[PDB]
Structures are given as C-alpha cells and as structure tokens.
Amino acid sequence: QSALTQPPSASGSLGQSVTISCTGTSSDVGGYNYVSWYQQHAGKAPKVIIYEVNKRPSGVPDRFSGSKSGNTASLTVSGLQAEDEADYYCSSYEGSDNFVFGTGTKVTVLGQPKANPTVTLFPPSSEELQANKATLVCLISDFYPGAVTVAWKADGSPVKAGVETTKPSKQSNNKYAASSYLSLTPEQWKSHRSYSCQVTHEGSTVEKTVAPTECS
C-alpha cells in the first residue's frame, strides 16, 4: 500500500560520508531481509547498488554499504564524490510477491568546486546553407553551479528574437552543459558583420563572436 518512509534530502562533503535511511513496518521491511537500494541519475534509468540489505552487485564500490537496524534499513556512502549526487530509492519485500519502495532521497555532495563555462560558438553547416537554412548554436558546457544566462546580439545590438535555449543538464563529469541556437537565413546571415553569444555565469561574463568563413 504505502511506501517506506525515506528522507527527502541529505548533504555530504567530498571525502566525507552520508547515511541515507528508509523505514517501514514489521510486515514488509521489518519482517524480512530484502531491503535493497537503487540509484537513478536525474531522470534516467535506475541502478542497484545494494541487495539483501547489506550486499552489492559486482560493480558498486566500497563506499556503498547499507544495513538493517529495526524496521528501517539504511545505506551510507563515504569517500563522497561529486558523481554521487543522485536520488536513491529503497525497496523491501512485502507479502504475496509484493515489492515496496521508499519515498526517495536527493543527496547533494556539497563543497563541489565552482566552474566557469566554456562557450563554443558554431557557424552554420557547409550543408545547412545548402538547404537554404542557417542556424547558430552556442555550446555552453563544463560549468558549475547549474545556472546560467545565454544572450545573443547582432552586429552589436540585441538579437533576442528566434532564440531557443535549453535547461542546464549534468554531464558525465558531474558538471553542467547547455546549448542555445539562433535561426537565421543565409541572407539574414550574410547581410551582417558578426553575431555573438553571451553567457553570464556567477558574475563572470564570457562572450565569443562569429563571422562567415568561405569553405566550411
């Protein structure tokens, strides 16, 4: 019926350790030894890092370890790293082949070094302009925290109009990425001098420009 009361948040520090614990009743959790832990990364397939309460599949490292106490098991992670930022779930065998999960926890490894973005501007394909099209993409990546402001200007004065930015998403490196594209026209692209993309991240503005190259 109900889930296994799991806290909604935790916080650790690079090298430290954090114990995420979920609780239930003496019917599902409290009765057996099948309290397992999952871990999916921000809207992405789950993964198992614990089973039979205190155990791990031949992949999860030695920082992962949970153990059942009362009617509540609990996982803890030391050697805390940035890549550990994620939502964890707790399961537990119920009655008639029934399995129950926790209410979820989102652990945030604090103390994570701050990064300034790396803006890469791109000129329309050698083939984009062949189909009578032209769109520029401002690749903002490798930055942290996860908030940024992307802006576009024409030959010098604002261009805001026909610009689509996307939310910032974590990468494989535990930092963020994010693009922003402009849709021009070969003609709305040629009849100019230089377009530029501006990325303001934590009081640190970056700004690359672009000009037409004949070849690619």
Binds its own copies by CB under 8 A, chosen from 9, 13, 57, 149: 57
Binds ligand PME by CB under 6 A, chosen from 6, 91, 179, 196: 91
Residue 51, burial from CB neighbour count under 10 angstroms (0-12, 13-18, 19+): middle
- How far lies 6's CA from each of 10, 30, 166, 205, in Å? 11, 14, 32, 41
Report the first-to-last Cα separation within the chain, whole angstroms.
Answer: 61
Decide: is 48 part of the binding site for its own copies (CB under 8 A).
yes
Strand partners, 206: 199
Strand 48-50 and strand 17-20: the pairing is unpaired
- Applying the rule CB under 8 A, the residues between 82 and 111 that interact with its own copies are 87, 89, 95-99, 101-104
What is the rounded distance in angstroms from the CA atom of residue 187 to the CA atom of residue 157?
18
What is the rounded distance in angstroms from the CA atom of residue 28 to the CA atom of residue 91?
9
Backbone CA torsion sign across 5, 34, 13, 166: negative
Residue 96 CB, nearest approach to its own copies (Å)? 7
Q: Which two tokens stand for residue 32?
A: 């057996």
Contacts of 152 (CB under 8 A, 6+ apart): 138, 158, 159, 160, 163, 180, 182, 195, 196, 197, 198
Binds ligand PME by CB under 6 A, chosen from 99, 126, 164, 191: 99
Residue 78 CB, nearest approach to its own copies (Å)? 22
Binds ligand PME by CB under 6 A, chosen from 14, 19, 30, 32: 32
CB under 8 A: which stretch of 11-19, 23-31, 61-69, 131-139 binds its own copies? 131-139
Residue 113 CB, nearest approach to its own copies (Å)? 19
Strand 135-143 and strand 48-50: the pairing is unpaired
- Applying the rule CB under 8 A, the residues between 9 and 38 that interact with its own copies are 38
CB under 8 A: which stretch of 24-32, 42-50, 62-70, 108-116 binds its own copies? 42-50
Closer residue to its own copies in complex, CB, 41/63 = 41
Question: Interface with ligand PME by CB under 6 A: which residues?
Answer: 32, 34, 36, 48, 51-52, 91, 93, 97, 99
Question: Interface with its own copies by CB under 8 A: which residues?
Answer: 2-3, 38, 40, 42-48, 51, 55-59, 87, 89, 95-99, 101-104, 120-123, 125-126, 128, 135, 137, 139, 141, 164-169, 171-172, 177-179, 181, 210, 213-216
